[PDB]
Design a protein around this ligand. Structure first.
Ligand code: HEM
Ligand code: HEM
Ligand SMILES: [Ca+2]
Lengths: 147, 150
């Protein structure tokens, strides 16, 4: 799943409305182990080739350490960038925001490769934040349920 | 009482994004109980003095009430010309174009999200409708999960 479905719907909305090729949300525990990783834009065969799930390093690890929106023309050019694993699709433009409530941040919603090579806009960032906020309340509630 | 602070921040952000992105002059969201009764109303585009002059909050009547009766998106080019229109109260800005949608999770209803007066004098678009639907769905997720949390 129920939370996982909800998070997938939010990822779909973010990806489709901003017109990004790829979108993902990683939800972590308080020791930064990944509890949920939902994504879209990548085929199952490519997923199988990449193999291992992301641990939340590089630019995503920064977003966990310092939860605030991060918009980049080229994710690779960022000083905190760790790089992609083998077989991962190339990705350039990046927009990432925290999935949170006032008390606590739980993860990161992030998009790459806006259509036609364009950088993500102010407007995109504001939208993705609003969507992330709804996910944040859903994660907060799931953690009450559990338990 | 006041809305949950995380819920309120979230709903105001969703209203702002909707209003900004469809280029509406005015945007609003009502949060309802399970019987479609308004509990909270959030808005943007109207100054504090105008709000004081209007002096009473909306009940969810007229064309707004249709968003619940018939829960699919409603676009109109002259909202107050509609036969269901109740009209604007004294001091309320006149409004013409309208795009509104129910806020729902599955079949469960949680309120309404609606925008007026697209700033280019034009009707709201298919693309506007799609965007507002998606934001309404996000608002639904927020209300449903705040509710359960509370
Ligand atoms: C489709 C949505 C996806 C997006 C938007 C995305 C985005 C990114 C980005 C931007 C980086 C590099 C960050 C940096 O340089 O610091 C990265 C790294 C990485 N990605 Fe993806 N990715 C996606 C899907 C996947 C999938 C399906 C997998 C594997 C199942 C995966 C596995 C990894 C791994 C292992 C890293 C190395 C850093 C880490 O472990 O956190 N990614 N991803
Ligand atoms: C800024 C965003 C707003 C929008 C888009 C909006 C839109 C509308 C529309 C389209 C109607 C007429 C519906 C019909 O004729 O059937 C209406 C009626 C009404 N409005 Fe607003 N309005 C907004 C803000 C406000 C505010 C801030 C107040 C009060 C402080 C208010 C009070 C009312 C009242 C009392 C009605 C009569 C119907 C009812 O009670 O539901 N409105 N509004
Ligand atoms: Ca615009």
């Amino acid at each position: 799943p129920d939370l996982e479905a909800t998070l997938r719907a939010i990822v779909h909305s973010a990806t489709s409305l901003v017109d990004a090729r790829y979108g993902a949300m990683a939800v972590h525990d308080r020791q930064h182990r990944v509890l949920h990783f939902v994504y879209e834009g990548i085929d199952e065969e490519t997923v199988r080739r990449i193999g291992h799930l992301p641990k939340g390093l590089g630019v995503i690890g920064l977003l966990i350490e310092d939860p605030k929106p991060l918009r980049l023309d080229d994710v690779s050019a960022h000083p905190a960038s760790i790089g992609f694993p083998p077989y991962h699709p190339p990705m350039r433009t990046f927009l990432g925001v925290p999935v949170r409530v006032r008390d606590e941040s739980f993860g990161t919603l992030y998009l790459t490769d806006k259509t036609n090579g364009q950088p993500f806009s102010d407007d995109d960032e504001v939208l993705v934040q609003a969507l992330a906020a709804a996910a944040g309340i859903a994660v907060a509630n799931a953690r009450l349920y559990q338990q």
